[PDB]
Every structure is written in structure tokens, then in C-alpha cells.
RNA sequence: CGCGGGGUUAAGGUGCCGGAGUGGACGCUCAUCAGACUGGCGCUCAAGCGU
RNA sequence: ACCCGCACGUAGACGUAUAAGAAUAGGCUCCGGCCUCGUAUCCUAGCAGGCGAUUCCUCCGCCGGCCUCGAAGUGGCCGUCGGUAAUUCGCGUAUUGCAAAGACACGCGCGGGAUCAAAUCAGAUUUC
């Protein structure tokens, strides 16, 4: 036995992200939301068949809010002392490795985090098995 | 072919039969239906025609206005049970209530007779 | 309406020092249920004697049962229909065997051909002729008429309207 | 035990949900026969000998007259007709025996050379053989003995056009 | 945590009413009327009833 | 009471036009493939007149410029007439109404492939059902003839033709009901009669 | 030579979702029984599970046959339609479709 | 009027498009472009009108 | 049509069986009689359906002959061969254990070569 915690069933309202207004038209406008501001813009007065607002009622149990589909909370760790953290706290957080780490250095963390027992997200990163 | 009238029995829509005592409309008619058979039963009261189809059975000489004791002795004077019993409308609705009652074992013996019966009709066509 | 009932609605003024032991104004109010009866009693008190609801009271509301609910009869019933134009009388015949089930014929018949409300129609009496010839409309004297018997040509068989297609053409000598 | 809790790891509360004896349909006697609904071995008539407990059923469809061993299967998954078989002669201590819930359960060189090959299907066995035919044998005596019925448990129950399974007398 | 109707609940009705048990048992809710012959209606409310 | 079948070849003589196009709409949506024969035989309720004037009306609904694309186009076939009544129920913009319309075959006559097969009829829509004795009605295939339809006589030689082989039909049928019912009879004198009292306590 | 049909289902139409006028709930889905024509016959399927077959176009475990499975939960209207949830909603393009109504679970 | 699951309704509807009755009782109406508490198809012992 | 090389196997089958018409104030028929009701008729047994019998000349299917079908094309008779519970059995159906990648054959295709018959512009291209 060795997982993440006892957690209750991870529900999310909506999987799908809240696109801008016209933002599939216009190469100028990027898909990150913005709130429309136009008196008749029909997606502000909430028309039917028009885009939803983001809204405080689609927000994430408190109890699974940031936690991985394994059950355990990303803990971004950028050498071994943010690893040596999580020894009390191995069944609640999994390592994330920083994407500026290196290969020894990651080398490191992957081996004590293993000790310690708790779970790495990207440990298929720039290393590889000798025999 | 058949008319209403003070003595016709109709058939309603349960397998009951019921004489008409006196007609109100030309849609509605006062019927009593005194009998020994629960099934074949039918309480006194307005009967739509809508709702009933007329059976050639006939009682003779039916007082119009008869109370249910008049339409009993009638009834079983004539033996309107039995001439019921004989027609085709009863015969083909026993013959329904027998098939509605098959279980699968049932079932499985009457393909069974069917195709020793079948073989054997096979066999007189085959003489033919 | 619905299922009308006879109802004998009793009602009479309140009690006073000055008058006392009212004169208890009774009325027969064919009405579905006991509040309507109620209602349609004082509407006809308020019109009639010019007694209220707030100055009195419902002595008894009792259901009028039919003595022979099993014997066809005649009804004839006396009526003042409001219309566009004013008030009108009229009496009609109906061949039924209830004094209920002759009142809702009524109330279709007049709806059908008149377009007459509950509200604009005013059932002034409702008696039986008891005795033959007594009744004047010419359908209902067809019906009293000696030794009746017709047959029913046409008659179109109760199929089920969920059997969409059927195999064989149906006869309508049944 | 062993260790002290070394996590905050809260315990379950005290569940109020008690296990009670399952409470079989009327039509599921021993001996009543069987339609399965479900399974390999699909739409066969079997012969019930004991109701077990959650739901499942003990059924043997004589081997020799329809291929169905003494098997397992659950109650919501067949249909309980109106003919009951005689179990007169069936040793009830051989169908307790088969009835207990442990009768239908069960790093080398070798180890690594089969892996990725295929399993093989086991034979049966030579006492399980034995039970089959020790119950068959006073159960088939019983079914010929029973009018036209041995023809009836070798044939597989099917629908045809026209039957309405809602207004049938199973 | 959790509201229990106790028309559905027995339980929860023994709790919040302890006559429920003994209401049950001594069949209060099928009591029958006072036995003796029932005397017959006056003719004179049945003159009243079918009047004009 | 409630089939699915394969094909249910529809046989169109006193049928009303409206109603046994909504039954078949119905069942075109549903799933079921229908075929119907004898398309000029159906009945318009009112008289001639009336669906002559209707349709009059309707050729009169004419687009302005040349009539080759987006103009309305005047077929004037019984089944072509059938074809657009049950078109005008159907959801025909969406691809779910094409599919429901191309699982639809209508025909004059009684076509090769379909005269040797059972022709249902529809109780809901048939005429002497629905119409009032006293009424008047119409036929589609004379209201045809009436506006345009060049097509009738052909299909009465061998509509005629289709009755000459049914007669035929019959008079082998009267001859297999023969050897049949004699064979039934002659089988009830060798009935051995253990399976005939069964048979007859079992209902068949 | 058995020469005879195994069929232990009731054969289905899947005629639409449950719907309004002009909002269409996928989670629903309305289908029609052969020989269910009232409410009380409606009610002998009730809790009976549905399959969709169908084969889409490639083998997947030895063949392409590929099922959605799902419930009768309730009767519609008055002529036996019955509403029925599968795991997820069917595809539209089986509206006038063929599903195969089982007879498990069996209350019989 | 927060995001969902189940149940029940309001106004409006149950011939098809369109989910739900070619539901039931009583009458009337055939209109050479009836009428629709009609949008189209179409409907006439209605799929119209009054209850 | 051949020669080399390469590649892949259903807007909804599960018994997806059923031919006059004509009328609905009548039709059918054995000439006895029959008709609200297609709530009917056929067919429905065996490892997703085996072996050997007992026993039946009943049914189905494939090829030839005789003829039949044109409306948008098909069926009958005879003959050959194969299978064939109408009746009765001895064998195997299991641990798939309470419902959820081998070989052969037949086809649709390509990438080049030349094989007929043609088309377009002796000589260039294209087409099953």
C-alpha cells in the first residue's frame, strides 16, 4: 500500500475552458477570457445558445480543489531540500521537477523522492536506464 | 340485419351480455343482464351503444320496463346462457382465454402435438 | 359542469334584537360542488330577498339524491339565458334518467347551439312529465312513439388506434 | 498496532448497516425449472436445487440431457417458469456440500518462459465429474419419469415474432 | 445531517411520538362506531328534501 | 398491435391523403420503410372542385425569372403530389428528413416488385372510416388527369392486367383450398385422437 | 441441424431524446418497445437494460462490434414509449434506431 | 437567473414538423380560395366551433 | 485478360416468412355453411447446434431437361447429388468457474510491364 490519501470522488463542473467573445475569427484576439462590456453584446446578457461566463458556482470542491487525477497536489521542487519537504507529507503531494533543473540534479531528486515514497509527475525527463 | 329492441341482447366490451329493458336515445339504451355466470353478469343501468355490439339472440316477449326478477325469468326461460355458450363470439373468446394461458412448458408440448399433427397432414397431402 | 349535484341550500338572515327568527329562505342549486352551491345561493338571495353573505348564514346544504336513477323519464326545464341582446326564456325537453343528467344535457345543448355560459344561463324550474303528450319537442315525441326499433347501418368498429396497420380491410356491419 | 499514525488519517465512522438473510421470489423453489437470461450459457432450461444467499442461485441442467454444469447464477438474471422437477433421491447432503462458498474458487526460470504465452484451459476434474453425476442421476431419473419434459430441458427457450414476453404466463 | 420523515421512518416516529407503537397496536385509527339500531330519518325532512 | 417489420407495402385505394401521410411521416421517422402502391387512388375529402382551385393556387406560385433553380416545380403525378404532402411534414432542411424520405418508395399501380407481396392498409386514414356517409370526395388520380397528368390510361390497361393474374391467383387458391380442407378433413379421420383432445384442451 | 433463431431481447426504436420544443436534453433518450402500446405494459420494462449495437469500422477486441448499454427508468406519455439513461448519451444519428431491450434484471 | 442530478408544474399544448391523445360525452358547420383558442403540410361524424 | 511487388476485409438483419380485387345499406363458400377480432397461418428440438445408432421416405438446398415470367423479369414440374429427430437412445457440451496475434481460401484495390477494343489531339495521351 502506497497511494495518495483517502480523498473524496474528484468532480469537475465543467472540463472545457471559458473561450473569449469572437476569438476564433480575429488572429488579433487570443483565446484567453475576457468579459464582454457591450451593452448588447448577447454573450454579456447571457442569450440562449451563446457562450457562458465563468462564475463562482463552477468552482472546485475544497476538499479536491488543485489535486491530480492521482489524488495527490503538484509541489513544484527545483533541487533535493524541496523534496526532503514532503517526507511528512508524501501521501497528499506528488514532486514536479522545474523545467530549468538539470540532469544530475534531477537524477537526484527522482532517487530520494523514491525513498522517501512519494511520487514524481515528470520522471521520464532527460535521463535514461543503464544496465 | 339487427335492430335494437325491448328483449336483444348485446354484447358490451368484458365478455358480458346484457337484454335492453327500454330505449333512451338513439345512442343510449337501459340494459339489465341477470345471470348465473359472474362473467356473463351485467348490473342494471345505461349502456352506450357505442360500446356494445348486438347478438342475434332475441327474448320474445319482454315487458318494456321489466325490473330484474321479469328479466331473470326471462332470462332463464329461454336459456340465454346456453345459445350464448354455442355461438361463434364465445367459442373464439374461450379459445382466447385458452391461449393466453399457456405456460412455456405449454408451450413447447402444443409445437410438439402441432408437429405430429403436421407430419401426419403432410401424409394426407402427400396421398393427394 | 363537471359532475353536478342537486344541492338544497337552506339559508337565512343573522339574528337580531329588533328581528328576530328569520324567515330561512331555502333553494334546490344544481352545482359540482357544496362551495359553488354556496355561492350561486346567495348570488340568487342577493338578487331575490336582498339578504348578503356578510349579513347571513348557511342554515343546511343537503344532496338531493334521484328516488329512481334506473327509470327513464321526461324532463322538462324552464330557463333565462342573458344574451348579447337581453334576456330571454325558453323551456326544453331531454329524455334522461336523472334530473342531474338532464340539467348537464342542457348545459351542452345550450353551449352547443347558443354558446350560453354557466354564468348567463338561470335554471328557473325543472319538472318530469309524468304523463305521455305532455312533451312538445318533436325529437323527443319520436322517442315516445309506439313500439320503437331501429337498426345501426354503418357501425364503425373500435379498433385500437395504436394497431397502425392492419392486414384486412374492416366491415362496418357490426 | 505497529506503527503510531504518522499521518492525520481520519477513521471511519461507525456504519448502522447490518447484514440480513435475502429474501427469495415466491416462484424461486427448489426443483422450480429455470430460463437463463444471461452467460454462455444462455437461454437453456436448468433445474434450481438450492437458493443461496445475495442473490445466487445453485442450478444444474442434467449435463447428459443440456450441456449446463452445476453452476452458480444470479436470481435477477433468470426467469422462474411454473414446472417444479421431484427432487426425491437427490442426496440434499451432496447439493449442501457443492453449496458452501469455497467449492467454485480455485519468480522461476519457468515464470519468465511463460510469460507472453497463452493459458491453458484446465481440465475439469475427477471428484467435481463425480458430484455432477451423483446429482444427475436421481434428477434424470425423476425428469423421465416426469411426462415430455426431458425433451423440454434439452431445448433452448427463444422469442419469435409476435410473442410479447408482458403478456406471457412463464 | 440527514432529515428522516417519520411517516416513512418508524423510528423516527417512536422517537418524536411514543403513543405511535400503541397507537398501532390497539388499532385507534380502525375503531368502530356505537353498536344499537340506528333510528330511521323523519318524513318530514324527506318532505323537505323533494319540495317543488 | 405494435410490428416491426421489414417493408409494409401500403395498398393507397380509400385512403385520405393527410392523414395517411402523417401516419406514414410518423413512420418514417420512427425507422420503418414504407412503400405505397396504388398512389392515385387516394381521397381527398370536399369535393373536386375545392382541391382543384387549392391546387390551381398552387401552380400559380411562380418564381419571377426562368423556372430552373429555386422555383417552384409543378409535378403532376398522384405519388408525386403524395411525395410532397409527406415532404411538407417532415423535416426535410435536415439531413435526419432526407434519410426518413429516402427510406419512402411511392408508386402508381402496384409495381412488379410489389405485387407479390401483402398490401396493409391504415384504419386511421381510411375513408369510409373518417368521412361522414354524407360527404363528398375526390380522387387524387382524376384530379391528376384534370390538371395535366399524362400517365392514366396506360396504368388502367395494366392495372387490369395486375386483376386478370389475381383471378388467376384465385382460382389456384380455390384448388389449394381444396386439397387443403379435404386434407384436414381426411387428416381428422386418422386424428389419433390422444393429440386431438390435447390440442383442443391447449386451445389450438 | 437446429434451423431456429436465438433472440432473448425485445427489439427497440430509439426515437429521440427527452425533449420540448426547441431544448433537446441528450442524458434522456425516448424509445419505443414492439408490442408496448399502454403504461401498464410500459411497466414490465422498467429497470430492464438496453443495448445499442453497432459496428463502427475497425476491429478492436477480434471484432468491430461495438455496444452502448444503459436502463429503462420510467414510462412516457400514453401509448408505451419509455425514457431510458445509458452510460453516456447515444449517438444522433440513431435517432430511428434498433436497441435491444434485455430481459434481465428479472423480477419473473 | 450560481454550477449539476432527480421529481412536479405554470403559461401554452398532445395529426406531422414537435415532446405529449388521430382521448372520451353532447350538438352545429361544407364555405368557387370556410374556419382554426391556424406558421407550413394539411384537415371536414376535424386536425373547426361551444361546454 | 496476364507478369512482378504492396495493402485491406451498412440512416442500421437477427424468422428482419405471408400477392387478387371489389363492397362497406354486404362479402366469402366445400353448397354443409362462414364473417367484430391478423388476438390469424407457416415455421420454431440437436456444440452458434457434433458422433454413432433406431427409424422416416417428410422437408430443404445445388446443378441439368421441360416449360414459364417484360412493367421496373421469375417461378413450377421432373431427374441427379448432399443434408434431413416424425419415434427412441448411448455418447461429448464443465475450471469461459454469478452478466461485462497461426495457416489456407475468396474478393475490392493500387505502383510499374505489355495485352485487346476505342476516344481525344502514321505518332503523343487516356479509358473497365
Redesign the pocket.
Known amino acids: 500500500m502506497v497511494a495518495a490519501k483517502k480523498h473524496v470522488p474528484i468532480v469537475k463542473?465543467?472540463t472545457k475552458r471559458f473561450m473569449r467573445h469572437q476569438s476564433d475569427r480575429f488572429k488579433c484576439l487570443d483565446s484567453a477570457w475576457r468579459k464582454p462590456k457591450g451593452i448588447d453584446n448577447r454573450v454579456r446578457r447571457?442569450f440562449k445558445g451563446n457562450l457562458?461566463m465563468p462564475?463562482?458556482?463552477?468552482?472546485s470542491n475544497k476538499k479536491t480543489k488543485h489535486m491530480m487525477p492521482s489524488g495527490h497536489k503538484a509541489f513544484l521542487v527545483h533541487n533535493v531540500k524541496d523534496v526532503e519537504l514532503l517526507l511528512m507529507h508524501n501521501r497528499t503531494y506528488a514532486a514536479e521537477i522545474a523545467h530549468n533543473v538539470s540532469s544530475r540534479k534531477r537524477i537526484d531528486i527522482i532517487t530520494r523522492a523514491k525513498q522517501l515514497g512519494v511520487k514524481v509527475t515528470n520522471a521520464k525527463a532527460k535521463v535514461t536506464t543503464e544496465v | 340485419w339487427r335492430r335494437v329492441e325491448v328483449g336483444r341482447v348485446l354484447?358490451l366490451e368484458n365478455g358480458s351480455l346484457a337484454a335492453i329493458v327500454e330505449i333512451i336515445?338513439?345512442?343510449?339504451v337501459l340494459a339489465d343482464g341477470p345471470s348465473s355466470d359472474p362473467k356473463l353478469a351485467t348490473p342494471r343501468g345505461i349502456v352506450?351503444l357505442?360500446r356494445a355490439?348486438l347478438t342475434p339472440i332475441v327474448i320474445p316477449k319482454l315487458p318494456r320496463g321489466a325490473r330484474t326478477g321479469a328479466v331473470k325469468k326471462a332470462w332463464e326461460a329461454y336459456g340465454v346462457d346456453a345459445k350464448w355458450k354455442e355461438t361463434?363470439?364465445a367459442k373464439?373468446?374461450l379459445q382466447?382465454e385458452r391461449?393466453?394461458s399457456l405456460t412455456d412448458f405449454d408451450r413447447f408440448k402444443?409445437?410438439?402435438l402441432?408437429?405430429?399433427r403436421?407430419?401426419e397432414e403432410?401424409?394426407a397431402l402427400?396421398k393427394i | 359542469?363537471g359532475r353536478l349535484q342537486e344541492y338544497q341550500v337552506i339559508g337565512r338572515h343573522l339574528p337580531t334584537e329588533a328581528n328576530p327568527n328569520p324567515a330561512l329562505y331555502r333553494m334546490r342549486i344544481f352545482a359540482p360542488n357544496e362551495v359553488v352551491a354556496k355561492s350561486r345561493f346567495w348570488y340568487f338571495l342577493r338578487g331575490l330577498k336582498k339578504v348578503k353573505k356578510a349579513t347571513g348564514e348557511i342554515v343546511s346544504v343537503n344532496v338531493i339524491s334521484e328516488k329512481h336513477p334506473l327509470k327513464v323519464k321526461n324532463f322538462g326545464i324552464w330557463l333565462r339565458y342573458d344574451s348579447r341582446s337581453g334576456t330571454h326564456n325558453m323551456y326544453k325537453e331531454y329524455r334522461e334518467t336523472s334530473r342531474v343528467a338532464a340539467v348537464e344535457?342542457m348545459?351542452?345543448?345550450m353551449?352547443?347551439?347558443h354558446?350560453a355560459?354557466?354564468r348567463s344561463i338561470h335554471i328557473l324550474k325543472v319538472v318530469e312529465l309524468e304523463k305521455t303528450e305532455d312533451v312538445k319537442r318533436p325529437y323527443i315525441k319520436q322517442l315516445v312513439a309506439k313500439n320503437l326499433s331501429f337498426?345501426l347501418?354503418?357501425r364503425?368498429?373500435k379498433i385500437s388506434?395504436?394497431?397502425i396497420f392492419?392486414?384486412?380491410?374492416?366491415?362496418?356491419?357490426? | 498496532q505497529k506503527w503510531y499514525p504518522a499521518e492525520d488519517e481520519a477513521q471511519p465512522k461507525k456504519v448502522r448497516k447490518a447484514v440480513r438473510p435475502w429474501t427469495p421470489r415466491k416462484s424461486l423453489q427448489p426443483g422450480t425449472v429455470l430460463i437463463?437470461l444471461?452467460?454462455?450459457?444462455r437461454?437453456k432450461r436448468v433445474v434450481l436445487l438450492k437458493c443461496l444467499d445475495?442473490?445466487?442461485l445453485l442450478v444444474t441442467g442434467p449435463?447428459?440431457?443440456?450441456?449446463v454444469?452445476?453452476?452458480?447464477?444470479?436470481a435477477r438474471?433468470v426467469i422462474a417458469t411454473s414446472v417444479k422437477v421431484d427432487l426425491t433421491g437427490v442426496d440434499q447432503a451432496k447439493i449442501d456440500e457443492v453449496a458452501q462458498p469455497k467449492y467454485?474458487?480455485?519468480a522461476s526460470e519457468e515464470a519468465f518462459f511463460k510469460q507472453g504465452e497463452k493459458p491453458q484451459?484446465?481440465?475439469?476434474?475427477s471428484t467435481?465429474?463425480a458430484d455432477?453425476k451423483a446429482i444427475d442421476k436421481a434428477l434424470i431419473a425423476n425428469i423421465?419419469k416426469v411426462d415430455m419434459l426431458?425433451?423440454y430441458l434439452?431445448?433452448?427457450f427463444?422469442?419469435?415474432?409476435?410473442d410479447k414476453p408482458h403478456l406471457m404466463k412463464f | 445531517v440527514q432529515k428522516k420523515n417519520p411517516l416513512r421512518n418508524k423510528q423516527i416516529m417512536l422517537r418524536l411520538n411514543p403513543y405511535a407503537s400503541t397507537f398501532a397496536k390497539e388499532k385507534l385509527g380502525e375503531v368502530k362506531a356505537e353498536e344499537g339500531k340506528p333510528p330511521k330519518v323523519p318524513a318530514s325532512f324527506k318532505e323537505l328534501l323533494h319540495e317543488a | 398491435?405494435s410490428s416491426?417489420?421489414?417493408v409494409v407495402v401500403i395498398?393507397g385505394?380509400?385512403h385520405?391523403?393527410?392523414?395517411l401521410?402523417?401516419?406514414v411521416?410518423?413512420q418514417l421517422?420512427s425507422?420503418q420503410?414504407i412503400v405505397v402502391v396504388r398512389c392515385e387512388?387516394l381521397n381527398?375529402?370536399?369535393?373536386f372542385?375545392?382541391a382543384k382551385?387549392?391546387y390551381?393556387?398552387?401552380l400559380?406560385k411562380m418564381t419571377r425569372y426562368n423556372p430552373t433553380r429555386g422555383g417552384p416545380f409543378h409535378f403532376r403525378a398522384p405519388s408525386r403530389?403524395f411525395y410532397?404532402?409527406?415532404?411538407?411534414?417532415?423535416?426535410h432542411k435536415?439531413?435526419?428528413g432526407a434519410?426518413a424520405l429516402?427510406?419512402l418508395k411511392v408508386?402508381?399501380?402496384?409495381?412488379?416488385?410489389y405485387?407479390?407481396?401483402?398490401?396493409m392498409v391504415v384504419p386511421?386514414?381510411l375513408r369510409?372510416?373518417?368521412?361522414?356517409?354524407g360527404?363528398?370526395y375526390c380522387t387524387v388520380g382524376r384530379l391528376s388527369h384534370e390538371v395535366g397528368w399524362k400517365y392514366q390510361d396506360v396504368?388502367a390497361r395494366?392495372?387490369e392486367?395486375?386483376?386478370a393474374?389475381?383471378?388467376?391467383?384465385?382460382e389456384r387458391?380455390?384448388l389449394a383450398?381444396?386439397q387443403l380442407?379435404?386434407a384436414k378433413k381426411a387428416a381428422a379421420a386418422k386424428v389419433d385422437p390422444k393429440v386431438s383432445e390435447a390440442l383442443a384442451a391447449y386451445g389450438? | 441441424?437446429?434451423?431456429?433463431?436465438?433472440?432473448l431481447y425485445v427489439?427497440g426504436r430509439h426515437?429521440?431524446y427527452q425533449?420540448?420544443?426547441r431544448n433537446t436534453h441528450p442524458?434522456?433518450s425516448?424509445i419505443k418497445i414492439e408490442g408496448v402500446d399502454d403504461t401498464a405494459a410500459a411497466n414490465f420494462y422498467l429497470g430492464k437494460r438496453v443495448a445499442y449495437?453497432?459496428?463502427?469500422?475497425?476491429?478492436v477486441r477480434?471484432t468491430?462490434i461495438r455496444?452502448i448499454?444503459g436502463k429503462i427508468?420510467?414510462p412516457?406519455?400514453?401509448?408505451g414509449?419509455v425514457?431510458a439513461?445509458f452510460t453516456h448519451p447515444l449517438?444522433?444519428?440513431?435517432?430511428?434506431?434498433?436497441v435491444r431491450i434485455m430481459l434481465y434484471p428479472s423480477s419473473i
Open positions: 463542473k465543467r447571457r457562458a462564475s463562482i458556482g463552477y468552482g | 354484447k336515445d338513439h345512442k343510449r352506450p357505442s355490439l361463434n363470439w373464439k373468446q382466447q391461449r393466453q402444443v409445437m410438439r402441432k408437429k405430429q403436421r407430419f403432410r401424409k402427400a | 359542469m344535457a348545459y351542452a345543448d353551449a352547443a347551439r354558446r355560459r354557466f337498426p347501418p354503418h364503425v368498429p388506434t395504436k394497431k392492419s392486414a384486412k380491410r374492416p366491415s362496418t356491419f357490426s | 437463463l444471461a452467460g454462455r450459457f437461454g445475495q442473490g445466487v449435463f447428459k440431457i443440456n450441456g454444469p452445476l453452476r452458480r447464477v444470479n438474471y467454485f474458487t480455485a484451459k484446465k481440465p475439469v476434474s467435481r465429474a455432477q423421465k426431458a425433451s434439452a431445448s433452448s427463444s422469442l419469435r415474432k409476435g | 398491435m416491426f417489420e421489414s395498398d385505394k380509400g385520405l391523403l393527410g392523414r401521410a402523417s401516419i411521416a410518423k421517422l425507422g420503410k387512388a381527398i375529402s370536399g369535393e372542385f375545392r382551385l387549392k390551381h393556387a398552387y400559380r403530389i410532397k404532402a409527406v415532404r411538407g411534414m417532415i423535416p435536415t439531413a435526419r434519410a429516402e427510406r408508386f402508381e399501380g402496384v409495381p412488379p416488385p405485387d407479390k407481396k401483402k398490401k386511421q386514414a369510409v372510416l373518417r368521412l361522414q356517409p360527404r363528398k396504368v395494366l392495372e392486367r395486375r386483376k393474374k389475381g383471378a388467376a391467383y384465385y387458391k380455390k383450398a381444396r380442407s379435404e389450438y | 441441424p437446429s434451423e431456429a433463431g436465438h433472440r427489439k426515437l429521440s425533449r420540448g420544443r442524458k434522456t425516448l449495437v453497432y459496428r463502427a469500422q475497425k476491429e477480434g468491430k455496444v448499454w427508468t420510467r412516457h406519455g400514453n401509448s414509449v425514457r439513461k449517438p444522433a444519428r440513431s435517432f430511428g434506431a434498433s
